[PDB]
């Protein structure tokens, strides 16, 4: 998750000078994996009930 | 003639009622969308 | 030579030579309609030559499409094309178009449409070619001798209660 | 806060075609035009018009294009004034829209001046008295409800009764030979009708692309959002007002349909926080229409002969929108569906029409007397129809049978084939002179043509056409009799 | 190198088929009238349409699919684009949703495009044969025209439209594909069983090869029913912008208005007349303005609209009915009294009108229709008030207008011409259908060996285009047409009507009655 967040931060030009902070939110909709949301850019790498 | 007059009276009453109900429904819809904002008053001064 | 204008007065492309070459390189005559559609979309209305090329492609093509189409008829397609040209484009068909239609009628064995087109050419055009008329007459005579002048069921005697109204 | 040109604002709310804009320096004046400068990936520019002030900073506006792809906080820049439309002789022969942009794809238009579409109507002192009959070439209009030059005309009617055909006939008869200019305003109507009118005008040389044209077209149609249909009429009227004042010319103004302006205002009214009125129109129905109507008038500088087509929803002539337009007209032509269903065209109901110049002082004494006699006879025939339905024609007196026959001939003689409805009718149209109509109707009233067959008066022109048709009817009847005789 | 979406907020409230979102602080924000995806699961999404952008920042959404999966508090992603659906020749013969998803059976086009400009159109001059003699003659329809089909429930509104779609199958198979008419049948709020039956009916006649069905059944949310007409016309505009002609059928706009009213009321829109939203006219107005006849400079393609509208007790004074009537270029009014009286299709010629006129008629049909209109007008005038020629022929014309299936142009025009020139004066009104059936499906001249015509026979189906080109009143065809009609009338009268008038036995009477009834439903 930290690597994905850093990669997203690098892509965003506006947040070049901003510091990176990671906040963890528990989502009951996903059983496996994780998702990252930064400045509206959402990356989904999770799975739910089959 | 009697039957048509009865129908005429009934129809006019229903039309008036329906038009009034429609207008009041529109007014209620307009009122509902209105939201009361934060009051900018000296609440402590009381 | 002279610029042509559309309904609203806008100029229309008149160089329709490449499109005729495209038409003369089709395998199935339904593809010829696609060329006409492309011409219309490109603001290049077909001229009399383009319609004659399309009729030639219809006559010389094997079938409408790669796969057979039920109830397909070359004569119907060419007649529809002529109707479009004369009515919705204001272009009088010349002798070449009617000769193509007559050739199709002779080739397909339809000797009655042959008679109708023969009369049409005699009326509008300066007569029908002798070869086509003779070929049409030969087809009609062959049909008559073989007994296939009319469908068999039409000659069957019927009655008031002997007709099956589906 | 005098010059608000370039003032920046931000979109604060978007609900349908109504958008709210917030200005930090103060909302510009009402009716001001705003441009959405933000790049929203739209295929068309977006322009808003301020209609209300919610507070010292917010202002509710109506969009002229579709509000698709519009985000909140989108930057908006004021244009420094109301919506401006080009004016002058350089606009002749062109097609414009609500915003005054040429849409005929015929190159840039050379505009020397522009005027705002919102203007103050003329005052009482700016009223000119012009009482002169306008010959439209139509027997019914010329006789029962004659039109006046520089006056306001209304064609009230339902759907499919023939409002558009009458407008086309009036154009063909009055605009081709008009000394001055013309302005046609298409408001909330079919686009194909606009194309047909444009083609017809080009064929009739009213719009001479290579030469000099004498008409302007301003189109806001059904496909357009309600914002454009509520201001296309203002744009066309602004052009007409310029031609009236600056050019000092006599201009014709054709509006079709004036009801769509009211309809567009009613559609947008709901989102503006206004309680609907009766039937469901906006509470400002009367004033909104009155402000526009008072601008359509002839002043001491020039004259505008306005012809407006009024749509009557579901043939309900008592509907508030049609009912509010009667008082704003000098000559009302009321069309009836029952007349049309009987094969009578134009489907004019002479017992419901009215004209201001229907006075002996304005028109000739003979014209007034003939018109009054025709109206009285038609009313008497309508009264006698009930007795005929109950008793029967045989039961009426001879004094009443003559009235019935004359009234039937009058009813059929009011019909006329128009030169623009040849496809609908399949026969060449007629142009009847004013004197010919008066003489023919005067002769018919006194029984000079009692022996002429009734059908000889159906779909013909003057009296000569009636006699020719009667002769043709006699010849064919004689041929039929000869055919029967041989059998 | 990530598939980064654009999260714009969360789902706040759900009220049936609509929802309200709350934007997360400091987010890009969604654009008006765009599509959004509600993340019902890490791999599944539910479509939605932006409808309102309030001052508070909340967003009004119109759920489109997977409504049962939507819950408050779920993430929402903004695509930032309007609605686009698949379009092309690869969709023909399939059942699809307004979103383009195919419905199993037992290029991208923007849905919010603008109508063609004023200078982008041309006059309507190409006819669209519905296959019914009444409509084709008294109510001409031209390609690029909006023709309303208004009537009461159970009066043939759907049957006539489906017949019009089917009538194009035979034509499309003969002429080039350039002039073929593609069909887009849009079902709105109808039963799912009806959609299946219509699909089977189209398949039976082979109309699926030139037709695609867009279905929004009653069990689907109002959003799909609200978008069905726009998606359908968008699919039909693909052919218009490429020099081809299409026919769009909306069955029916009455239910789309109900769906739109539901959506508007649920999203806190002020109600208008009959609770409908204020901008209910503009909906259909912009829907039907997209059907036009493009000018030759843009290709010459067209879209023909056949919106269907239902009335209550033949009341055309309703709100939406009036709006639609004031938009279309005509109307086919199907009367309930005529339908129950045996007249089918129950076209009320008095209340029906086509504003295009004879411009949308073929040269062959123009003269026949022009004379027929006058004859029928005279017959109606005289009937309302003496067996004159107009009255003798008007009754037979009315008898010829009864049909069950669309009729080929050659058969219909020939029958109308025969009835117009007095060839049916000696034929009883009851036997007109039997006479027409014998004329079309039989040849009395060949049967009795008295046919001397060279080419003009009713079994030569290729004569349809020759007739359309030259017309019946031309020296090429007129002589043989008259000879055939004379021979057929003589043989029919002699060999059939004499025997039919001589039947007295109950068995024979019943047999003749059954035969006549079958003929009514056979031609
Ligand atoms: N021309 C016709 N001849 C005979 N029967 C017909 C004809 N047209 C329709 N019908 C029949 O009439 C009935 C109603 O037809 P249809 O389904 O088209 O009506 P509708 O207007 O769609 O009504 P609704 O959709 O409200 O049920 C059906 O049984 C149909 O088969
Ligand atoms: N003068 C006329 N002669 C014959 N038919 C007419 C005439 N005027 C109108 N119509 C009929 O009305 C149709 C045109 O209606 P239109 O003028 O557009 O009415 P509106 O705009 O009031 O709905 C024609 O197609 C025809 O059926
Ligand atoms: Mg009109
Ligand atoms: Mg139905």
From TrEMBL, chain A:
Q: Where is the signal peptide?
A: none
Residue spans making up a coiled coil are none
Which domain of life, per UniProt? Answer: Eukaryota
Q: Where in the cell is it found?
A: Membrane
Family named by the database record: Belongs to the ATPase delta chain family.
Name-wise, this protein is Uncharacterized protein
Organism per entry: Trypanosoma brucei brucei (strain 927/4 GUTat10.1)
Please name the taxonomic classification of the source. Answer: Eukaryota, Discoba, Euglenozoa, Kinetoplastea, Metakinetoplastina
TrEMBL record, chain B:
According to its UniProt record, where is this protein located?
Answer: Membrane
Domain of life according to the entry: Eukaryota
What is stated as this protein's family in its record?
Belongs to the ATPase gamma chain family.
* Record's protein name: ATP synthase gamma subunit
Q: Which organism is it from?
A: Trypanosoma brucei brucei
Taxonomic classification: Eukaryota, Discoba, Euglenozoa, Kinetoplastea, Metakinetoplastina
Full-sequence portion shown in this chain = 256 to 301 of 305
